[PDB]
């Protein structure tokens, strides 16, 4: 039987009226036929003498005022378990991959409260990885969130395709992938990568792409929530990576104000802060299990000063900033050293040397940055000696951060390199004690271990 | 909806008198009073730029000419008027 | 939901029947427009483009059984500015404003099984007594209580139903 | 570690304190279905109309 | 067992009815809910919702009551039943609740059982008056030496720790709080939009690297409801509040009230409400500096009349220190520019210092001190008065510095001696200092015997000198810490401890 | 006599409704009785049908719907002349000092025009 | 430690089940402020246990 | 597939949705001028041989269809932080940035290497392009780097003039 | 007004090459009706991922900065982009 009906569509945005006796609760979604589709709506506001507003997941193009509208006496619900492995699947979990049906155990809920506070579980199990500036800088412990910071193609999608190969591959526990908002070639090219890579039965994937509209790509990021917090609740230690969280809180703005709400700041929903942290908070490592999480950030117009990323900030335990300056230049990671830090740089928690070194590396290049525009201005010769001692081994620090990615090796036509962390400690301390003051700068550029760059020294 | 300066004494001056030209078109009374900006009803024989006299040695403008008020700005101390004056 | 539009028509309308000693009248007419209101075919006349005036005379034309005061007056002023569905809002209006002015409580109880009439007689003098009014008792008896009674004189209610205490034990617990 | 195992201890100790009191009111709900009537109705009712 | 604790809980039940104000919800949306009725609704009214969930009526409407939903909101449906309290808004208060973590509400997260607070108090309370209100000249010793010896904060002040992100605001916060382990100054912590796991760690810390029975720690993680946020610093008011008028000294920190502000803009405009410059409501001034205008120390005469002579001449006070945190360093927004008008004195974190590996990264010449040194300690304030002159002498000769050479001797010395004495003012995260420290190497600094070290040693030479000092000249030490006093024999004494240190390693 | 009902309190702003007759003009002060304090209100605009828009010259918190509001001729007056050398007063001409009250002779309102 | 205390939770269990016959029948007398009918208790073992 | 200015078409839908009444956003500009040029470029694609056989009802077999689109847009004064440009800028699989400035210069096309990029890369180029590109790439971005640093170094080490004569070759 | 339940579709062929049309389908060149091979929806949805193939296949501008630099391949989705003229 139907309960309700239809009585505005504007733009995404449908109202449906029901008798003021079992009106559908917040959160809860519906059923209507859109011609031969089935469409689900998602109820948003429960408002004035029994009407819902709500939120299409689906073109809401087609559908006629008036219409009969179904109740379902539950939230959206998605698969979840075993049988999400190895499926593409839509924002509802349906499979978008043509193999079949999903085969599920159980479904769960997308909404649901976050972990109370004394569930919290602490950790300092630090990750290696392959990328010596992102170990350097910013090295990151499993259980906790990492996010890449980039404006408009500064690197941020090679370096979450580098920290998958590098991470994933040693780790022996599912993963769950969320294509919030992600183009579509490269979402087919990633699944068509980890086909070929025989990694693909150890990976749940949900994509939700740009040509979708805003519901979608809104709840795309719960469902890959859900699956990541059942294998979590398992007890497993789960890698989850997202593509874009801005496109979360972009899909918000879209629908924002056609839901009645007053436009905030910088032309935002008032309730961007809620909208984060309500999906945020639970991306936590509890006492059952840990979610280790990489998040790719973009950032507006590459300004940091943007709400979307400043308020992201402070959700982090590690935040490599990406810079389209270094980009530009051609220094690739384009990592910017003084920006990027870790909570775990700490001399307890890494081996003392360790911090010592990366504060060094800092204390150097923030020293070159002051006087970048004297030397521009005034000339080279100006300098003291020992200024221009400072110079140059801040020119082959800032060479030696860079490295090639067997993913960035189509880009390039070169083979990829991949550094153990002491060996990244070695060469920046055997660089900022001179121990290679006498090899010339491209002898640190785009190698791996220091005995390489002695190697390419030779070569030079 | 909004509540269109539409009140009680008003409405109930209709129901009584159904076709309002039974009071003459030269007078009117003031029905809000914000910050200078003047509202007055009735008035059926006003135009855009005329010298409204108020209570006192007072003249406010009449700028807007609206449906069913006329909109003036008050030319000195506006803070003494009150509803209701004619 | 146009309470608020509701309240100057209705205002007007109740300080008109006290002046001309008809507020019974005048309640069962403001019904009959109400009726008017609910029909499906002229719903749709007023979700129309029509101008106000033949649009008004058009809804007069239905309701001939009204006064020249009331009737002609009030539809054609509300409908110079289009709200006639507020007359559904309008008579509840007037109930309780007349309920104001006559000094009446239509409090409302509820139980599990029929009182006697020396019980419902000492619950009517009782609320008479806790407020200042002369009370109007309506009951229904619905098992969901399962025992004592439901009290509600409007926004204000006491609750003597041992659902109630049952459960605020559970909370208390 | 003994702070945390008094912690412990006492916060089961509620736990468990409260599932049985859930139990209890339970019980105690289906007694007064299966006892009440309508003369302890009309006594209840006397002794609230009071007020 | 768990029969007699039930059997009494039992007879503490009440059979007959009670009469209360009945409301109709009308519209529930994004944690705010439309209610119809309730009459005899009042502005900052508690109304009760089913499932033990409290509203705040803040919008009264001709028609309807405009309530924010304190706690989950998403169950909440039109037609439900609500209930008036007649209560504006109270939290517990007391000593019982010292030590212990809770939420807005003051219910405990802990997990470690129930309060024994001592009573309830109000969150919205006015405050003292003009002439109810004493100067602050008592020292409130942070245990840096950067801050202490520069930038003096005193009991009953309002000092701003404004910064950008990752620059040291939380850990100047928390280690302030660590150093009131031993003083009679009770500590309050209240971590506003924090991430949870952050708020763990900082709790582990607490209790690692101290004392945690000193602090009350109000929690809000990002997860919980706008109302809820925008409250938590209130409530953590009336906790101090406590505290300062019952003629004891207290210290209360507001983490991130930029986020306070957020919340209240979220609140603002979801009611509907008018907006302002930054689309902040026209009242967010009037929203801070009523919240910190709470904070003052307060004459003996007041606390007395308010303990009914409990005591009768204590004189109690409650230091506040908020943290800003602005965004690419823009001092001209309106939160912070608000902020900045409230209060009496700023701790500016400046970032590229703290890059610079110089922490903690304050910054002379930017943040000052609006009490003077009338909150300075005697010693502390005769051994600090010559550091402001040779940092301010060291910022305009070290830009000289870098490419001259041929100076003039007194200009080398000053620009020497300011790169020296800026080395000094750097220490460890979690090691506060005591005065006597502090005032030592402060005296070593000023009276010359680092000239004669002035290279990269300075921190195994300070290091070195606390140990000495520790091995054989105690007495001085207990000394000073007892007093903080200054004379000639203290001037000889401190002399002759260096002179004998200086033949040490 | 009090002849004005409150019907709105949104923050610091308050609407009160009177007889058609007894309107206040712009500037007037009106008070009313929140809890056992007394309030005083500044009319700022006078919307239709006898509304008036006010600020509170107070703390709002503790005011209901339905409270009544008695109107006052004239704006905020305040003492004037050498007795108020020495103390210390607020908006309204009221000690925030402890001495006791003003004795003054003469009570000046606040708003006029200028000469 | 924490095994040992879950071991304690069992015997607990085990020994409130005992009390909350005795709690129910309490509460039922209480709210209703009678002597309350010991008949038709074919119910209470799955309440009991 | 040429889509001559997507900024207009952008003003278009602005001027639809204003005067229909619908709520603005940034500029003025709708927020489904996101929705408006995502589900227009996305469009563009290349499609497998099974896409192609299904569609066709079996009649064309192992062809792979593909479609090309060249949005372009107009920036005010270089603005990029405007609310268009950020959107198309933020879809598209890469950029190519025309400048008042290398114009004027007389470098035409005014093409600026290093804010320019294809992400598909050296894939979408005939294997001598591939390698032949790689070095040009990375050539003229620290050409210019150098070119700035250097501007007032009346002497110079050779390395370094080398490859400050060789960018200014490539120029 | 009728409502004719059909969205707009669009004339679609080979014979549109060489063609001047406006946005309904009409000929604006003057060189007589079209010849098209049916009509076609104009607001449709996309390919899904399922349904895409990767892009290894250069498409060459004509000029030497672009294809050497930014090369373009088919299937790819490049952004011109700059101030006027
Ligand atoms: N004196 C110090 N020595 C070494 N590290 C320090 C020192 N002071 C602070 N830090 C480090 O600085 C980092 C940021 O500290 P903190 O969280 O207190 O900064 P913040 O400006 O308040 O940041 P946010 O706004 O992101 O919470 C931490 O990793 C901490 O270990
Ligand atoms: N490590 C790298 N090596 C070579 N090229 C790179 C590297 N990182 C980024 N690029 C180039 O910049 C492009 C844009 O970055 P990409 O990660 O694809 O998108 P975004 O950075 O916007 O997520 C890449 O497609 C590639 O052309
Ligand atoms: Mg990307
Ligand atoms: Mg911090």
Same mark, same amino acid.
């Given at each position: 039987?139907?309960?309700?009906?239809?009585?505005?569509?504007?733009?995404?945005?449908?109202?449906?009226?029901?008798?003021?006796?079992?009106?559908?609760?917040?959160?809860?979604?519906?059923?209507?036929?859109?011609?031969?589709?089935?469409?689900?709506?998602?109820?948003?506001?429960?408002?004035?003498?029994?009407?819902?507003?709500?939120?299409?997941? /689906?073109?809401?193009?087609?559908?006629?005022?008036?219409?009969?509208?179904?109740?379902?006496?539950?939230?959206?619900?998605?698969?979840?378990?075993?049988?999400?492995?190895?499926?593409?699947?839509?924002?509802?979990?349906?499979?978008?991959?043509?193999?079949?049906?999903?085969?599920?155990?159980?479904?769960?809920?997308?909404?649901?409260?976050?972990?109370?506070?004394?569930?919290?579980?602490?950790?300092?199990?630090?990750?290696?990885?392959?990328?010596?500036?992102?170990?350097?800088?910013?090295?990151?412990?499993?259980?906790?969130?990492?996010?890449?910071?980039?404006?408009?193609?500064?690197?941020?999608?090679? *370096?979450?395709?580098?920290?998958?190969?590098?991470?994933?591959?040693?780790?022996?526990?599912?993963?769950?992938?969320?294509?919030?908002?992600?183009?579509?070639?490269?979402?087919?090219?990633?699944?068509?990568?980890?086909?070929?890579? *025989?990694?693909?039965?150890?990976?749940?994937?949900?994509?939700?792409?740009?040509?979708?509209?805003?519901?979608?790509?809104?709840?795309?990021?719960?469902?890959?929530?859900?699956?990541?917090?059942?294998?979590?609740?398992?007890?497993?230690?789960?890698?989850?990576?997202?593509? *874009?969280?801005?496109?979360?809180?972009?899909?918000?703005?879209?629908?924002?104000?056609?839901?009645?709400?007053?436009?905030?700041?910088? /032309?935002?929903?008032?309730?961007?802060?809620?909208?984060?942290?309500?999906?945020?908070?639970?991306?936590?490592?509890?006492?059952?299990?840990?979610?280790?999480?990489?998040?790719?950030?973009?950032?507006?117009?590459?300004?940091?000063?943007?709400?979307?990323?400043?308020?992201?900030?402070?959700?982090?335990?590690?935040?490599?900033?990406?810079?389209?300056?270094?980009?530009?230049?051609?220094?690739?990671?384009?990592?910017?050293?003084?920006?990027?830090?870790?909570?775990?740089?700490?001399?307890?928690?890494?081996?003392?040397?360790?911090?010592?070194?990366?504060? /060094?590396?800092?204390?150097?290049?923030?020293?070159?940055?002051?006087?970048?525009?004297?030397?521009?201005?005034?000339?080279?010769?100006?300098?003291?000696?020992?200024?221009?001692?400072?110079?140059?081994?801040?020119?082959?620090?800032?060479?030696?951060?860079?490295?090639?990615?067997?993913?960035?090796?189509?880009?390039?036509?070169?083979? /990829?390199?991949?550094?153990?962390?002491?060996?990244?400690?070695?060469?920046?301390?055997?660089?900022?004690?001179?121990?290679?003051?006498?090899?010339?700068?491209?002898?640190?550029?785009?190698?791996?271990?220091?005995?390489?760059?002695?190697?390419?020294?030779?070569?030079? | 909806?909004?509540?269109?300066?539409?009140?009680?004494?008003?409405?109930?001056?209709?129901?009584?008198?159904?076709?309002?030209?039974?009071?003459?078109?030269?007078?009117?009374?003031?029905?809000?009073?914000? $910050?200078?900006?003047?509202?007055?009803?009735?008035?059926?024989?006003?135009?855009?730029?005329?010298?409204?006299?108020?209570?006192?040695?007072?003249?406010?403008?009449?700028?807007?000419?609206?449906?069913?008020?006329?909109?003036?700005?008050?030319?000195?101390?506006?803070? $003494?008027?009150?509803?209701?004056?004619? | 939901?146009?309470?608020?539009?509701?309240?100057?028509?209705?205002?007007?309308?109740?300080?008109?029947?006290? @002046?001309?000693?008809?507020?019974?009248?005048?309640?069962?007419?403001?019904?009959?427009?109400?009726?008017?209101?609910?029909?499906?075919?002229?719903? @749709?006349?007023?979700?129309?483009?029509?101008?106000?005036?033949?649009?008004?005379?058009?809804?007069?034309?239905?309701?001939?059984?009204?006064?020249?005061?009331?009737?002609?007056?009030?539809?054609?002023?509300?409908?110079?500015?289009?709200?006639?569905?507020?007359?559904?809002?309008?008579?509840?209006?007037?109930?309780?404003?007349?309920?104001?002015?006559?000094?009446?409580?239509?409090?409302?109880?509820?139980?599990?099984?029929?009182?006697?009439?020396?019980?419902?007689?000492?619950?009517?003098?009782?609320?008479?007594?806790?407020?200042?009014?002369?009370?109007?008792?309506?009951?229904?008896?619905?098992?969901?209580?399962?025992?004592?009674?439901?009290?509600?004189?409007?926004?204000?209610?006491?609750?003597?139903?041992?659902?109630?205490?049952?459960?605020?034990?559970?909370?208390?617990? | 570690?003994?702070?945390?195992?008094?912690?412990?201890?006492?916060?089961?100790?509620?736990?468990?304190?409260?599932?049985?009191?859930?139990?209890?009111?339970?019980?105690?709900?289906?007694?007064?279905?299966?006892?009440?009537?309508?003369?302890?109705?009309?006594?209840?009712?006397?002794?609230?109309?009071?007020? | 067992?768990?029969?007699?604790?039930?059997?009494?809980?039992?007879?503490?039940?009440?059979?007959?009815?009670?009469?209360?104000?009945?409301?109709?919800?009308?519209?529930?949306?994004?944690?705010?809910? #439309?209610?119809?009725?309730?009459?005899?609704?009042?502005?900052?009214?508690?109304?009760?919702?089913?499932?033990? #969930?409290?509203?705040?009526?803040?919008?009264?409407?001709?028609?309807?009551?405009?309530?924010?939903?304190?706690?989950? !909101?998403?169950?909440?449906?039109?037609?439900?039943?609500?209930?008036?309290?007649?209560?504006?808004?109270?939290?517990?208060?007391?000593?019982?609740?010292?030590?212990?973590?809770?939420?807005?509400?003051?219910?405990?997260?802990?997990?470690?059982?129930?309060?024994?607070? +001592?009573?309830?108090?109000?969150?919205?309370?006015?405050?003292?008056?003009?002439?109810?209100?004493?100067?602050?000249?008592?020292?409130?010793?942070?245990?840096?030496?950067?801050?202490?010896?520069?930038?003096?904060?005193?009991?009953?002040?309002?000092?701003?720790?404004?910064?950008?992100?990752?620059?040291?605001?939380?850990?100047?916060?928390?280690?302030?709080?660590?150093?009131?382990?031993?003083?009679?100054?009770?500590?309050?912590?209240?971590?506003?939009?924090?991430?949870?796991?952050?708020?763990?760690?900082?709790?582990?810390?607490?209790?690692?690297?101290?004392?945690?029975?000193?602090?009350?720690?109000?929690?809000?993680?990002?997860?919980?409801?706008?109302?809820?946020?925008?409250?938590?610093?209130?409530?953590?008011?009336?906790?101090?509040?406590?505290?300062?008028?019952?003629?004891? +000294?207290?210290?209360?920190?507001?983490?991130?009230?930029?986020?306070?502000?957020?919340? !209240?803009?979220?609140?603002?405009?979801?009611?509907?409400?008018? &907006?302002?410059?930054?689309?902040?409501?026209?009242?967010?001034?009037?929203?801070?500096? #009523?919240?910190?205008?709470?904070?003052?120390?307060?004459?003996?005469?007041?606390?007395?009349?308010?303990?009914?002579?409990?005591?009768?001449?204590?004189?109690?006070?409650?230091?506040?220190?908020?943290?800003?945190?602005?965004?690419?360093?823009?001092?001209?927004?309106?939160? &912070?520019?608000?902020?900045?008008?409230?209060?009496?004195?700023?701790?500016?974190?400046?970032?590229?210092?703290?890059?610079?590996?110089?922490?903690?990264?304050?910054? &002379?010449?930017?943040?000052?001190?609006?009490?003077?040194?009338?909150?300075?300690?005697?010693?502390?304030?005769?051994?600090?008065?010559?550091? #402001?002159?040779?940092?301010?002498?060291?910022?305009?000769?070290?830009?000289?510095?870098?490419?001259?050479?041929?100076?003039?001797?007194?200009?080398?010395?000053?620009?020497?001696?300011?790169?020296?004495?800026?080395?000094?003012?750097?220490?460890?995260?979690?090691?506060?200092?005591?005065?006597?420290?502090?005032?030592?190497?402060?005296?070593?600094?000023?009276?010359? !015997?680092?000239?004669?070290?002035?290279?990269?040693?300075?921190?195994?030479?300070?290091?070195?000198?606390?140990? !000495?000092?520790?091995? +054989?000249?105690?007495?001085?030490?207990?000394?000073?810490?007892?007093?903080?006093?200054?004379?000639?024999?203290?001037?000889?004494?401190?002399?002759?401890?260096?002179?004998?240190?200086?033949?040490?390693?």
């Amino acid at each position: 039987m139907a309960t309700g009906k239809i009585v505005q569509v504007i733009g995404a945005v449908v109202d449906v009226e029901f008798p003021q006796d079992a009106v559908p609760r917040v959160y809860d979604a519906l059923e209507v036929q859109n011609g031969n589709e089935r469409l689900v709506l998602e109820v948003q506001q429960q408002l004035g003498g029994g009407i819902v507003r709500t939120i299409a997941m /689906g073109s809401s193009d087609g559908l006629r005022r008036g219409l009969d509208v179904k109740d379902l006496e539950h939230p959206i619900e998605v698969p979840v378990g075993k049988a999400t492995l190895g499926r593409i699947m839509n924002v509802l979990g349906e499979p978008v991959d043509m193999k079949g049906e999903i085969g599920e155990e159980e479904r769960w809920a997308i909404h649901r409260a976050a972990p109370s506070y004394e569930e919290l579980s602490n950790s300092q199990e630090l990750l290696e990885t392959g990328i010596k500036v992102i170990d350097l800088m910013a090295p990151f412990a499993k259980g906790g969130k990492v996010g890449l910071f980039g404006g408009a193609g500064v690197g941020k999608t090679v *370096n979450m395709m580098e920290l998958i190969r590098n991470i994933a591959i040693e780790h022996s526990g599912y993963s769950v992938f969320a294509g919030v908002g992600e183009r579509t070639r490269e979402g087919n090219d990633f699944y068509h990568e980890m086909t070929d890579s *025989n990694v693909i039965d150890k990976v749940s994937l949900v994509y939700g792409q740009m040509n979708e509209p805003p519901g979608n790509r809104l709840r795309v990021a719960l469902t890959g929530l859900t699956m990541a917090e059942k294998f979590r609740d398992e007890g497993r230690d789960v890698l989850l990576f997202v593509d *874009n969280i801005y496109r979360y809180t972009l899909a918000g703005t879209e629908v924002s104000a056609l839901l009645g709400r007053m436009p905030s700041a910088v /032309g935002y929903q008032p309730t961007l802060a809620e909208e984060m942290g309500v999906l945020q908070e639970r991306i936590t490592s509890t006492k059952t299990g840990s979610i280790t999480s990489v998040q790719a950030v973009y950032v507006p117009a590459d300004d940091l000063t943007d709400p979307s990323p400043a308020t992201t900030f402070a959700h982090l335990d590690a935040t490599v900033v990406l810079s389209r300056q270094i980009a530009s230049l051609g220094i690739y990671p384009a990592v910017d050293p003084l920006d990027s830090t870790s909570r775990q740089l700490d001399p307890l928690v890494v081996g003392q040397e360790h911090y010592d070194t990366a504060r /060094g590396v800092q204390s150097i290049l923030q020293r070159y940055q002051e006087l970048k525009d004297i030397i521009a201005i005034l000339g080279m010769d100006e300098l003291s000696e020992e200024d221009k001692l400072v110079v140059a081994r801040a020119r082959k620090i800032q060479r030696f951060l860079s490295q090639p990615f067997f993913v960035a090796e189509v880009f390039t036509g070169s083979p /990829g390199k991949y550094v153990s962390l002491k060996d990244t400690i070695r060469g920046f301390k055997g660089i900022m004690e001179g121990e290679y003051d006498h090899l010339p700068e491209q002898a640190f550029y785009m190698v791996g271990s220091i005995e390489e760059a002695v190697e390419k020294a030779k070569k030079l | 909806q909004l509540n269109s300066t539409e009140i009680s004494e008003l409405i109930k001056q209709r129901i009584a008198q159904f076709n309002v030209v039974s009071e003459a078109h030269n007078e009117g009374t003031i029905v809000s009073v914000s $910050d200078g900006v003047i509202r007055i009803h009735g008035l059926a024989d006003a135009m855009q730029g005329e010298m409204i006299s108020l209570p006192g040695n007072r003249y406010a403008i009449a700028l807007n000419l609206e449906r069913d008020s006329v909109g003036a700005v008050v030319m000195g101390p506006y803070a $003494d008027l009150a509803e209701g004056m004619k | 939901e146009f309470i608020t539009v509701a309240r100057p028509y209705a205002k007007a309308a109740f300080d008109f029947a006290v @002046e001309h000693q008809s507020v019974e009248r005048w309640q069962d007419m403001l019904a009959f427009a109400a009726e008017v209101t609910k029909n499906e075919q002229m719903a @749709e006349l007023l979700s129309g483009a029509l101008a106000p005036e033949t649009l008004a005379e058009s809804f007069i034309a239905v309701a001939g059984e009204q006064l020249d005061e009331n009737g002609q007056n009030l539809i054609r002023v509300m409908a110079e500015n289009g709200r006639l569905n507020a007359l559904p809002d309008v008579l509840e209006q007037f109930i309780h404003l007349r309920a104001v002015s006559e000094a009446t409580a239509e409090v409302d109880v509820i139980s599990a099984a029929a009182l006697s009439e020396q019980q419902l007689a000492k619950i009517s003098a009782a609320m008479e007594k806790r407020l200042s009014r002369k009370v109007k008792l309506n009951a229904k008896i619905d098992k969901s209580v399962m025992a004592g009674v439901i009290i509600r004189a409007g926004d204000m209610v006491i609750d003597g139903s041992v659902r109630g205490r049952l459960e605020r034990l559970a909370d208390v617990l | 570690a003994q702070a945390e195992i008094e912690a412990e201890r006492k916060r089961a100790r509620e736990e468990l304190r409260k599932q049985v009191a859930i139990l209890a009111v339970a019980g105690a709900e289906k007694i007064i279905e299966r006892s009440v009537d309508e003369a302890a109705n009309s006594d209840i009712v006397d002794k609230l109309v009071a007020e | 067992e768990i029969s007699e604790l039930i059997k009494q809980r039992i007879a503490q039940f009440n059979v007959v009815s009670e009469a209360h104000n009945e409301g109709t919800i009308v519209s529930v949306s994004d944690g705010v809910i #439309r209610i119809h009725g309730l009459a005899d609704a009042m502005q900052g009214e508690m109304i009760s919702l089913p499932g033990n #969930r409290y509203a705040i009526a803040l919008n009264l409407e001709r028609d309807s009551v405009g309530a924010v939903v304190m706690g989950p !909101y998403a169950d909440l449906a039109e037609g439900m039943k609500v209930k008036a309290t007649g209560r504006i808004l109270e939290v517990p208060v007391g000593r019982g609740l010292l030590g212990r973590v809770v939420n807005t509400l003051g219910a405990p997260i802990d997990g470690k059982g129930p309060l024994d607070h +001592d009573g309830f108090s109000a969150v919205e309370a006015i405050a003292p008056g003009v002439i109810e209100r004493q100067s602050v000249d008592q020292p409130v010793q942070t245990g840096y030496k950067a801050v202490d010896s520069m930038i003096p904060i005193g009991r009953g002040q309002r000092e701003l720790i404004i910064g950008d992100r990752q620059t040291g605001k939380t850990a100047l916060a928390i280690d302030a709080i660590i150093n009131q382990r031993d003083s009679g100054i009770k500590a309050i912590y209240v971590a506003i939009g924090q991430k949870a796991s952050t708020i763990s760690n900082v709790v582990r810390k607490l209790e690692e690297h101290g004392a945690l029975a000193n602090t009350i720690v109000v929690v809000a993680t990002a997860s919980e409801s706008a109302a809820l946020q925008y409250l938590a610093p209130y409530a953590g008011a009336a906790m101090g509040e406590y505290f300062r008028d019952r003629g004891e +000294d207290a210290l209360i920190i507001y983490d991130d009230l930029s986020k306070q502000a957020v919340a !209240y803009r979220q609140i603002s405009l979801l009611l509907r409400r008018p &907006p302002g410059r930054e689309a902040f409501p026209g009242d967010v001034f009037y929203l801070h500096s #009523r919240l910190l205008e709470r904070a003052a120390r307060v004459n003996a005469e007041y606390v007395e009349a308010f303990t009914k002579g409990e005591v009768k001449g204590k004189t109690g006070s409650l230091t506040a220190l908020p943290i800003i945190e602005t965004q690419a360093g823009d001092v001209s927004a309106f939160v &912070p520019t608000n902020v900045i008008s409230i209060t009496d004195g700023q701790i500016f974190l400046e970032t590229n210092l703290f890059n610079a590996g110089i922490r903690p990264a304050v910054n &002379p010449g930017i943040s000052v001190s609006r009490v003077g040194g009338a909150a300075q300690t005697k010693i502390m304030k005769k051994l600090s008065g010559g550091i #402001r002159t040779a940092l301010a002498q060291y910022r305009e000769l070290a830009a000289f510095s870098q490419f001259a050479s041929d100076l003039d001797d007194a200009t080398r010395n000053q620009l020497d001696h300011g790169q020296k004495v800026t080395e000094l003012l750097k220490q460890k995260q979690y090691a506060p200092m005591s005065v006597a420290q502090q005032s030592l190497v402060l005296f070593a600094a000023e009276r010359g !015997y680092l000239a004669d070290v002035e290279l990269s040693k300075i921190g195994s030479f300070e290091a070195a000198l606390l140990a !000495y000092v520790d091995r +054989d000249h105690a007495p001085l030490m207990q000394e000073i810490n007892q007093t903080g006093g200054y004379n000639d024999e203290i001037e000889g004494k401190l002399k002759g401890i260096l002179d004998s240190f200086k033949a040490t390693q």
